[PDB]
Amino acid sequence: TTELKRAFRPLTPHINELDALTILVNLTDKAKCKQKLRDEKWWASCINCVNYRQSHNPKFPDIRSEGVIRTQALGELPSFLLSSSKIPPYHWSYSHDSKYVNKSAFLTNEFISCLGESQKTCKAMAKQLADITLTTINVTLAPNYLTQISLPDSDTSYISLSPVASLSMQSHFHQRLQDENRHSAITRFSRTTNMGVTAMTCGGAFRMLKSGAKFSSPPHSFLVLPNIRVCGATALSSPVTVGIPSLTAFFGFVHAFERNINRTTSSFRVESFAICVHQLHVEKRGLTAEFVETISAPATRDDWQCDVVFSLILNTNFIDQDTLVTSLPKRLARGSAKIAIDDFKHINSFSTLETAIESLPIEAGRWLSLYAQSNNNLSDLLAAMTEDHQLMASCVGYHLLEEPKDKPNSLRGYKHAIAECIIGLINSITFDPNTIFWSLKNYQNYLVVQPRSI
């Protein structure tokens, strides 16, 4: 009876019509005659469950958040990028309640379509028709637990973003990585029934995407920032991959450095940047949350952290040592970013590309270009990963679900949209320049940090 229960659940592939519907009634209980019972109260409980069916789970990392999202990715991204639009959108699940994870099994198991999409049947259809309400978004940004991200949209303007984990993607990376123990990185989440139905299937183990083998290093106007030793970063670049932090986080490190110099020199305006990574070391360090109000700690989550040492080269628009040091931002994706005092000598500015790359120390490293070749699938990703083991997938940009509007509370008074992570493969160059220098491109549908050549 467990093999029958796992099949209707969304982390298995799909599967006489008189046999199937008698199963779905018995799954709602915590026999053929229990199916014939028709309680009136039972029907309105299941009608609420098809309302809180969700496409994308806001309550993924944090189970205290509240929201309903049943949309599809807006627009289609090119072939070198990857998001929830390319994979067919049908592995959708149920959230918002712990008592109704069983009672949602009648109308949301989606044997590919879903049942949620004599007198009682007419009444039930009327409630479902009026309470289907395809493609809704119900978030309040005032008292809940969401993430908020401002990105420089167009110019002299910003848009607030809130990334939300996508349930069709989480099922895709979980089902495919059963075979490969080398490229899987299991992260466990507690209070599984509060998370959703899509967590109760896997038991808490979500099976992320680990970037092959360990990091190694072969010996390989412009401003040079060397040796940014970051202590505790997030390896969770996406809700999917664990490894080097999202390139939007490297962009936030550069643009906050751009924005701090504009207090003194207001014409600075960085155009692009180049990253030279040494020494990743991804580890499962934990994270002890503080006590919250009846005073205890919240629910615990597996935490992946990394220790990136890298040299950052920026192409400036056109500065004292005391100004360059105090304008350094002090965090790189939640991690303490610092330069040693003995490396304050190497913050000089150069006019050519050759003199800058000969200037920096710690010669062995990688230079991080994007890999642009037809990854429409995880099987397309893993085919590139098994050829070259050090190929390092991460989060590259954001993909909007809806165009930005005015919300009553957004981080710093901008237009807010709800986006999703875009996964791209990240090469490495021995060292031409437009392949290396990264910059943020703005499109109406999505936002991606691309190299200048692509």
Binding site: C231, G286, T326, K330, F344
Partner: protein
Amino acid sequence: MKLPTNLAYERSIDPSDVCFFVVWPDDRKTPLTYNSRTLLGQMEAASLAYDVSGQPIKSATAEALAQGNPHQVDFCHVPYGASHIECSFSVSFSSELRQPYKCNSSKVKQTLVQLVELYETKIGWTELATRYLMNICNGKWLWKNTRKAYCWNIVLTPWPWNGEKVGFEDIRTNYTSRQDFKNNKNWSAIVEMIKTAFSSTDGLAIFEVRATLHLPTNAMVRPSQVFTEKEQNSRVFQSTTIDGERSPILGAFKTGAAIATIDDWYPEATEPLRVGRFGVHREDVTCYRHPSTGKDFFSILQQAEHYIEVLSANKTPAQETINDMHFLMANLIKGGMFQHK
């Protein structure tokens, strides 16, 4: 004063990981390493011989309870011919204290900037910056490694500084009280950096701290250890990669919690606590400054308008009701979400 639906500050003190190095005679340095090893203990748990109610379980006979219980741990020690151990990290003092990171009420944002500027003038940053710096300059950030040592020496290297690095030789003998730190040749020059950092709109104040632990022969070191969910190894260390080898660290959040053990103003104060909302003790699982007392951090934000008229007067501000001012400031140096939910 009401609390807004959006209020959060960044932290003003930013530590790093503590890395461990082994210094050999003839003065070459090697990163400290560790290994896992399985041990064999007895079968003591009190859940293996007793039930929940209290009577002895009948399955645990005398032969079945002397059987041997294997466990796996990580084990890190000092190598044999080594001389001492280096322990290096670095702190900043940013002054993100002056403005909120996030606020949606113009009345409350003005009340902060009046509180910070009136605390700065009337009371001043001498008391807090003394208490933070007396956790860097002794071995407070060396948690258990200070204990069972011959001697340890702290050497500072500040950045907006002329020369002659600041030294602190032979703690547990020399630097015991507050007065022994003040008798140092350059102590007021470093306290007035953290005062300069906090009081400026752009204050930076980098310190580079480096310790020198003289342990006994072949002795233990106690690094920090991980926090993970359970689906055999019972003690797993946190680590980095130094050169080409693994090495135990003592984490960045673990280091910042040792600098911020200041709070000895809770209503029955004996031992200083780590600074936080409704300041908890993890030794004994309790909450001093519980919200029923009225001296947690949200019950002092609602007295923040009241603390302006006390500081703007000319009468001496009556020490009991400025211990609440020190606790109010130390949580804004610490930062955090300050909503109700």
